[PDB]
Amino acid sequence: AEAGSRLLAPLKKPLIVSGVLQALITLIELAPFVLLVELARLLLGGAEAERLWTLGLTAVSLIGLGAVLAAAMTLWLHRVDARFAHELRGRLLTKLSRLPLGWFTRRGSASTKQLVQDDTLALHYLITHAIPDAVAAVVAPVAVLVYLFVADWRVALVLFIPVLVYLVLMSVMTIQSGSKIAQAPRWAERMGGEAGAFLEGQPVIRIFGGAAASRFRRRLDDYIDFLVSWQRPFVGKKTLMDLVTRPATFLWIILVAGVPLVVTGRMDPVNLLPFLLLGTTFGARLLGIGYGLSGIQTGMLAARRIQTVLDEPELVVRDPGTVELDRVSFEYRPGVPVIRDVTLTLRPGTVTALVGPSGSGKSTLAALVARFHDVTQGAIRVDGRDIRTLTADELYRRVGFVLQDAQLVHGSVAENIALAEPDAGLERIRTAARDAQIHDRITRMPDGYDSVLGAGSALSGGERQRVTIARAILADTPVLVLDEATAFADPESEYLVQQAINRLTRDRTVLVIAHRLHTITHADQIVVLDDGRIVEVGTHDELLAAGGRYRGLWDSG
Amino acid sequence: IRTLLRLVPAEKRGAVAGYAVLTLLSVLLRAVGAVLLIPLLAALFSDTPSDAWLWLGWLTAVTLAGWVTDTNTARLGFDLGFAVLSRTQHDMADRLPNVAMSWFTPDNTATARQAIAATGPELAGLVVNLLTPLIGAALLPAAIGVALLFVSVPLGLAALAGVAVLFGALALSGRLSRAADKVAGETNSAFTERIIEFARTQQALRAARRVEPARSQVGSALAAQHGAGLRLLTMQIPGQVLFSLAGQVALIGFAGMAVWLTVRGQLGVPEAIALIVVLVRYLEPFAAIADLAPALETTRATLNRIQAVLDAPTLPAGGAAPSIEFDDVRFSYGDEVVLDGVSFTLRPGNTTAIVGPSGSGKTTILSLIAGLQQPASGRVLLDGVDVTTLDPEARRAAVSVVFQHPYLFDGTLRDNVLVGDPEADPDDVTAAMRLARVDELLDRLPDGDATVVGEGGTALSGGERQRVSIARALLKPAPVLLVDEATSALDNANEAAVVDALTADPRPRTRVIVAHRLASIRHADRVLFVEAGRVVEDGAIDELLAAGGRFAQFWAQQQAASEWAIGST
Numbered sequence A: 001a002e003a004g005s006r007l008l009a010p011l012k013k014p015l016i017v018s019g020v021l022q023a024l025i026t027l028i029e030l031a032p033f034v035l036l037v038e039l040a041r042l043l044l045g046g047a048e049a050e051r052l053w054t055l056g057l058t059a060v061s062l063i064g065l066g067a068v069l070a071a072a073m074t075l076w077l078h079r080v081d082a083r084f085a086h087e088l089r090g091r092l093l094t095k096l097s098r099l100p101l102g103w104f105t106r107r108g109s110a111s112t113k114q115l116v117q118d119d120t121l122a123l124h125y126l127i128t129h130a131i132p133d134a135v136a137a138v139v140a141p142v143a144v145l146v147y148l149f150v151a152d153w154r155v156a157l158v159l160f161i162p163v164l165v166y167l168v169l170m171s172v173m174t175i176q177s178g179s180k181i182a183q184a185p186r187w188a189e190r191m192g193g194e195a196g197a198f199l200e201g202q203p204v205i206r207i208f209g210g211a212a213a214s215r216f217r218r219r220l221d222d223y224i225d226f227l228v229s230w231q232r233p234f235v236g237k238k239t240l241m242d243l244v245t246r247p248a249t250f251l252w253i254i255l256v257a258g259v260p261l262v263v264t265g266r267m268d269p270v271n272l273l274p275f276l277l278l279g280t281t282f283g284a285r286l287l288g289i290g291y292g293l294s295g296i297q298t299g300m301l302a303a304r305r306i307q308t309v310l311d312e313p314e315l316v317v318r319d320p321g322t323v324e325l326d327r328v329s330f331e332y333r334p335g336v337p338v339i340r341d342v343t344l345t346l347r348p349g350t351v352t353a354l355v356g357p358s359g360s361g362k363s364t365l366a367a368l369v370a371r372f373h374d375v376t377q378g379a380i381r382v383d384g385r386d387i388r389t390l391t392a393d394e395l396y397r398r399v400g401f402v403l404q405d406a407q408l409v410h411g412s413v414a415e416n417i418a419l420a421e422p423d424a425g426l427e428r429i430r431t432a433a434r435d436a437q438i439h440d441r442i443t444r445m446p447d448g449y450d451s452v453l454g455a456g457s458a459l460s461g462g463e464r465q466r467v468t469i470a471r472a473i474l475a476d477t478p479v480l481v482l483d484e485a486t487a488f489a490d491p492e493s494e495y496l497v498q499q500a501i502n503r504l505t506r507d508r509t510v511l512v513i514a515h516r517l518h519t520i521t522h523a524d525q526i527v528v529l530d531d532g533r534i535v536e537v538g539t540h541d542e543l544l545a546a547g548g549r550y551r552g553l554w555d556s557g
Numbered sequence B: 001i002r003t004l005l006r007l008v009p010a011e012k013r014g015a016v017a018g019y020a021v022l023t024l025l026s027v028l029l030r031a032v033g034a035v036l037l038i039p040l041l042a043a044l045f046s047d048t049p050s051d052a053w054l055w056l057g058w059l060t061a062v063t064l065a066g067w068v069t070d071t072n073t074a075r076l077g078f079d080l081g082f083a084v085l086s087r088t089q090h091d092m093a094d095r096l097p098n099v100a101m102s103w104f105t106p107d108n109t110a111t112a113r114q115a116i117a118a119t120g121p122e123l124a125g126l127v128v129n130l131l132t133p134l135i136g137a138a139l140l141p142a143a144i145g146v147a148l149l150f151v152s153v154p155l156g157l158a159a160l161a162g163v164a165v166l167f168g169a170l171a172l173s174g175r176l177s178r179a180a181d182k183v184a185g186e187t188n189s190a191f192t193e194r195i196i197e198f199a200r201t202q203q204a205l206r207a208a209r210r211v212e213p214a215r216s217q218v219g220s221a222l223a224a225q226h227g228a229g230l231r232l233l234t235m236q237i238p239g240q241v242l243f244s245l246a247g248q249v250a251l252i253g254f255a256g257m258a259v260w261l262t263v264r265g266q267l268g269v270p271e272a273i274a275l276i277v278v279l280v281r282y283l284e285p286f287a288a289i290a291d292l293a294p295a296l297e298t299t300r301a302t303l304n305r306i307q308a309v310l311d312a313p314t315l316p317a318g319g320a321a322p323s324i325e326f327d328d329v330r331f332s333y334g335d336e337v338v339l340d341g342v343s344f345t346l347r348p349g350n351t352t353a354i355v356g357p358s359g360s361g362k363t364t365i366l367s368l369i370a371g372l373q374q375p376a377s378g379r380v381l382l383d384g385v386d387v388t389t390l391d392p393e394a395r396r397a398a399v400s401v402v403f404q405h406p407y408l409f410d411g412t413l414r415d416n417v418l419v420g421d422p423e424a425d426p427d428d429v430t431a432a433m434r435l436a437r438v439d440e441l442l443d444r445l446p447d448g449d450a451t452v453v454g455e456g457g458t459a460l461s462g463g464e465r466q467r468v469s470i471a472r473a474l475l476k477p478a479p480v481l482l483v484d485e486a487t488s489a490l491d492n493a494n495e496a497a498v499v500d501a502l503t504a505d506p507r508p509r510t511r512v513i514v515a516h517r518l519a520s521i522r523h524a525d526r527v528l529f530v531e532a533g534r535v536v537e538d539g540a541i542d543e544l545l546a547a548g549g550r551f552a553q554f555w556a557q558q559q560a561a562s563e564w565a566i567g568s569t
Ligand SMILES: Nc1ncnc2c1ncn2[C@@H]1O[C@H](COP(=O)(O)OP(=O)(O)O)[C@@H](O)[C@H]1O
Pocket: A106, A107, A332, A333, A338, A358, A359, A360, A361, A362, A363, A364
């Protein structure tokens, strides 16, 4: 992994120390199985109880040493990682304050919580648990293998017969099901989607029923029969694959390989003893390597995702209230335009709206004017300056906006409307709310303007949208951008929201994403977009006389 | 856990018994094979090496019998795994349609998704990859303790007394490991609650040109919390180290006892060494149970989810226009009331409008009429017959509905319409197209109603989806019709289709509508305004308008909004 490696650059030196301390602890936890062989040697030699007590103290001292080393290394690694976690959480904080604002409206990507919380927990477990586990799970089997090879190469190599048989059986079961193995994750995901549809589409099945229930059950039975036909023929392979690694088979083959040697006098009876101590569970050791290494990939993926977030492009700054657009071309994906050669100019103080078929770059164009993104070709010149050359302090003082998904902010209502100018007094906020037609509801709250807002509250969607509108009042700009869907997203508050958004709109170079064709009857300008290209330009009456796309669309409704 | 024995079918009770008996046979055989090391190794290490052959003969016969019974157990395990997979999936598919819609909360829906989808490869191999190792390694230490008891009762007691100690050690290790991981995850999540709050609102802050103070505040909070977060770490120290120390101090204690008896004279050196080897075989099964802790935990979670599916509260059980009746009906998700004191008796052949704000339970009322759920309180009846007490055929064929969502099942347009009545003739289909205004879409489609309208087939907008949804309810011959829609001015064909549907439908049947717009609920004979789940007004449209109540104010405000535009007053 390249990105994951780049994220874990400052932890390489501590993690190398962890990979040695745990490799040491693994040997020390296998040491008493050497001292038992030594004890058997002494008892064959009949050494006096003093040497016996010396070896009994050696073993308990090594056990204490290996139990203290693990505690010390855990304590040290949980403070190596605990400060790298702080560094990462403080670095993502700076990165989040420099991404393009459209990044947080991305699609086909992990959620923010899945990117900052889960991918940090899976990194904490990559460092503190999974790397110790994965170095222990490789030191233990390899140390056991080399020790048993030192004891006797004959019975040591015999341990590989069951391992070779297991690998041969796994390979034979894999090659005969390569297409099935490839299909299985895809069928799992497809059936997950089908189950989701069957669950969210439950009421149709419950009431209308008929073909839908039978179709879902048929797909479920097809998946079940796919699994059964896949794995039923391999039961003959997959049962004998398990017996070969069982400790009883290892014990039997150890004894069949050693007892002839002992009786024939070809190896001392103590050289067989290490295999009995350690080599019995050797099969279950190598099966632990795979689960050990599986714990590194799950966290390396999280490291890759966080580094991908950290590698995103930043909101670059380069170099009369009139919004301009000239040869505006914008691509979401590589070489996939949605806006193509849009040239437009809005006079100061004019309420402008743009229309078109749903999914034609209208909201994308409005956001681009608001600078949620930067156009690939062309330039949007507000007051003669390209937006790309203005800082977040300057541009967003000249171009405010209230799009959909209005966001509340921590603090009370007084310090939720006055984010632009926190020095503003409560009276200014109150008159702003009165202009926004939200002062009536705020006074009805038990705490008035002192009610604490944040992630959630008792306010509905329309009410918090009105609060954001009131905030936009204080963030005075000669320009504004809007989405008409906000004007009627809340039917109960639709009238008050309309009055508020109109009051905000007054005497400002307002751009609106218009959907209802009847709402642009007396706007100052109208434009039509098709496949990212301009088709019609003019006022309401001019386009009515044109008889083109807009007239056909409005005659349909 | 008793769930796993509940999942197995009644057919395979002849395989459950033949699996348990052969598992006990394999456990006793493994214990005997471990205990047979005592005379075998005693002859091996003594001054008569050749004597060990006979006990090697018994050991190899024991091993081959273990091979045969283990093959039988694993074959029956795979077969019973497929059988219980099929039983579990089919019982889930036969349960969920009968599960009340109240059970389908977002978290319950997610668990049901995982149970139906994610539990495929597991239940095919639970009893063979988990129960066989777990049961064969949990009963082997005690079995060896029993077997050594027949060699020396004090020796068997010494072996068996440690089994309880080491199982307690495994329980302690598991507790102190998983609790430590829980605490670690909780601390990691709590630290990052600030960054979520920042990231969600960072567009709003940017619009307020106040990003830098918020970033500095969150960074200062992170630094302050990490200052205390890098101290006082104790919990995970006795984690895996605890068991790794228990399963080594036990080995040293037992070996030291064996050599203490050796010097005391009760045992010889070969017996002491063979007992050391056997008392090591006594300890190896505890490692296997430790390695099965993650798999056992995951399987326990999945079996808990499957038991959640298999324990959801099912709905009990017991062609002119009917009458739908409501008597003090209430419904609530948790303690949040959705319906409060709703009562009506709509006469057959009537048309009624249920209206109000989104906080009410209009769609809840329609779903209760349709029999999607048992009401929390009150009684919902079809001419005095409670909906839950109908035969399934009558319940499914009683009501036709148009949902808030379209719920298109990704089929063809003809398939999307014919679910209302697959047995109907093409003339009824044509009537449905005429009334629902989908014929305008037939003008666009290449193949017409046979064209695929799936998510990847055709990118239909909201208007087409709602029109075909209207056609679905129109086609069905159900004696009762209901409509709940979210029609808007985005596509004006929607309201025209609804107006044609609820008016020109020639069949006689009770009709209900739920909508927000004006100038379309006129055709409803009655009106039932609802506020916070309680009916507040009743009567006709014009009657309520003349009465000057809540409906009149709603009409006035929505009329003012509808006439409004952008650019001037
Ligand atoms: N990541 C993206 N997000 C949004 N739209 C995208 C993306 N990539 C490509 N597009 C295209 O750009 C168009 C923008 O549609 P838009 O007018 O914004 O819809 P809406 O008016 O509902 O916001 C879409 O029709 C879509 O095909």
